[PDB]
Write a protein that binds this ligand. Structure first.
Ligand SMILES: CN1c2c([nH]c(N)nc2=O)NC[C@@H]1CNc1ccc(C(=O)N[C@@H](CCC(=O)N[C@@H](CCC(=O)O)C(=O)O)C(=O)O)cc1
Ligand SMILES: Nc1nc2c(ncn2[C@@H]2O[C@H](COP(=O)(O)OP(=O)(O)OP(=O)(O)O)[C@@H](O)[C@H]2O)c(=O)[nH]1
Ligand SMILES: Nc1ncnc2c1ncn2[C@@H]1O[C@H](COP(=O)(O)OP(=O)(O)OP(=O)(O)O)[C@@H](O)[C@H]1O
Ligand SMILES: [Mg+2]
Length: 387
């Protein structure tokens, strides 16, 4: 007997899609969390700009600057951090100070929350994440921007830390590409990567936008590296977003669904680790662009995807952004223990899907396919006998 799994995957209630898509409680909870961080980040920058504006008018001692800082939200930084902030503001150039007084922090969400691939967590320790980037409109720079890299990082840290001090169960964590607020009890964390963009082009596009009811020069979108050798690196997140969105248009609405399923499979096989979300997306896109498939039957499509995935990761997965210094996934001749473990799981997937298809009953078919996605869908009646 052959079983069809289309309803198993796509049913918005009892199906896998029904288990992966965020509830209104979780979705609005993430939006509220993002709103709080955006408000605080802007308020913190205004407080810092207020101190700098006082400096501009009447010359203040470094002593007075440090006491002003201690009263603001910057106080939630360490004593050494508070002092450097007061030092940077005090030792700031006259021309550099004018640039800062006009600094306007902007925000734009990237990642799965933006292109709607965000799944509900499965195993303990797994969390939902919002990738809300902060943009700093400044003049184009080559090496070091007008407004210091150190100052921008500290002010963002102060904003995040000030929110942690106001919430039990919240914790701050610094990664290489962003600052992070972790909410363990809610299985949630928000990442805040900082970018530098051309102020002139930003104002231009903003003026045209408001009058019409717009991506800037990609080479001038600089990501701030916290612990890296380089303070800045040209990493435009818009490249990945446009790539995936264009792929969804080119391939169809079933692309986001199958991408969710592979990520759910990833969450089921590893409590932590496994292939990156972007690597799964890129590989899946390559398959649906090269191999014929039927969107009306995502059960067959997933089988087709699982069949070709191992060869995709073996070849190595190229990044949608050619600017990337590394591929999303290494080729076979560069595989270590980590990649071999991933290859082992990938080769196992198609066997699991086939086994579930040849099960003796709906009940048996459910638990077999649940080997790939874990126990989420409990309704075996979603599985129908193949015509
Ligand atoms: C990203 N971007 C980008 C560009 N170009 C290139 N090459 N790379 C880039 O990364 N161009 C545009 C943008 C960079 N420039 C801008 C970034 C942010 C803003 C701005 O006014 N943001 C608003 C919020 C936008 C939002 O919530 N938006 C919502 C969308 C609507 C909603 O969710 O309700 C959201 O963030 O989810 C704000 O700061 O309050 C204005 C311009
Ligand atoms: N160019 C480039 N961008 C990346 C890479 N990895 C992550 N990013 C960016 O970082 C953002 C967040 O990526 P992830 O959180 O790992 O992927 P995701 O789609 O959010 O997956 P989940 O977080 O598991 O839902 C993405 O929107 C990408 O733009 C990479 O290797 N190259
Ligand atoms: N090439 C890149 N360019 C810009 N940002 C990136 C890039 N790769 C990852 N990021 C950022 O890092 C986050 C992805 O996290 P990563 O894959 O580094 O593991 P992690 O979440 O740091 O692991 P852990 O949760 O154990 O700290 C994304 O939210 C993204 O904003
Ligand atoms: Mg993410």
């Amino acid at each position: 007997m052959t079983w069809n799994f289309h309803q198993y995957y796509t049913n918005r209630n009892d199906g896998l899609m029904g288990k992966l898509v965020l509830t209104d409680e979780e979705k609005n909870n993430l939006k509220a969390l993002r709103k709080i961080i955006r408000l605080r980040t802007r308020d913190v920058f205004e407080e810092a700009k207020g101190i700098a504006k006082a400096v501009k008018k009447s010359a203040l001692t470094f002593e007075i600057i440090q006491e002003k800082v201690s009263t603001t939200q910057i106080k939630h930084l360490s004593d050494s951090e508070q002092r450097e902030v007061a030092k940077l503001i005090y030792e700031m150039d006259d021309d550099a100070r004018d640039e800062f007084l006009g600094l306007t922090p902007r925000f734009w969400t990237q990642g799965s929350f933006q292109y709607d691939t965000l799944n509900r967590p499965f195993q303990p320790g797994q969390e939902m994440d919002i990738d809300d980037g902060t943009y700093m409109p400044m003049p184009i720079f080559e090496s070091e921007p007008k407004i210091g890299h150190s100052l921008l990082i500290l002010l963002v840290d102060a904003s995040l830390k000030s929110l942690v001090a106001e919430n039990h169960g919240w914790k701050f964590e610094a990664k290489q590409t962003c600052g992070r607020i972790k909410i363990e009890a809610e299985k949630t964390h928000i990442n805040v990567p900082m970018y530098a963009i051309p102020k002139d082009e930003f104002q231009k596009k903003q003026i045209a936008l408001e009058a019409n009811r717009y991506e800037l020069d990609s080479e001038n979108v600089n990501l701030a590296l916290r612990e890296g050798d380089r303070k800045w690196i040209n990493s435009d997140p818009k490249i990945v977003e446009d790539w995936f969105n264009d792929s969804c248009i080119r391939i169809g609405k079933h692309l986001r669904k199958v991408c969710r399923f592979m990520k759910a499979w990833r969450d089921a096989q590893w409590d932590v680790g496994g292939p990156s979300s972007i690597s799964l997306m890129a590989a899946t896109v390559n398959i649906l662009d090269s191999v014929a498939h039927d969107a009306s039957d995502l059960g067959e499509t997933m089988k087709i995807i699982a069949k070709h995935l191992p060869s995709e990761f073996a070849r190595g997965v190229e990044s949608p952004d050619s600017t990337d210094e590394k591929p999303l996934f290494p080729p076979s001749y560069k595989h270590g223990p980590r990649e071999m473990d991933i290859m082992s799981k990938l080769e196992r997937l198609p066997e699991i899907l086939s086994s579930a298809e040849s099960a003796d009953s709906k009940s048996e078919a459910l638990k077999k396919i649940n080997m790939a996605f874990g126990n989420r869908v409990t309704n075996s009646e979603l599985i129908v006998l193949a015509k």
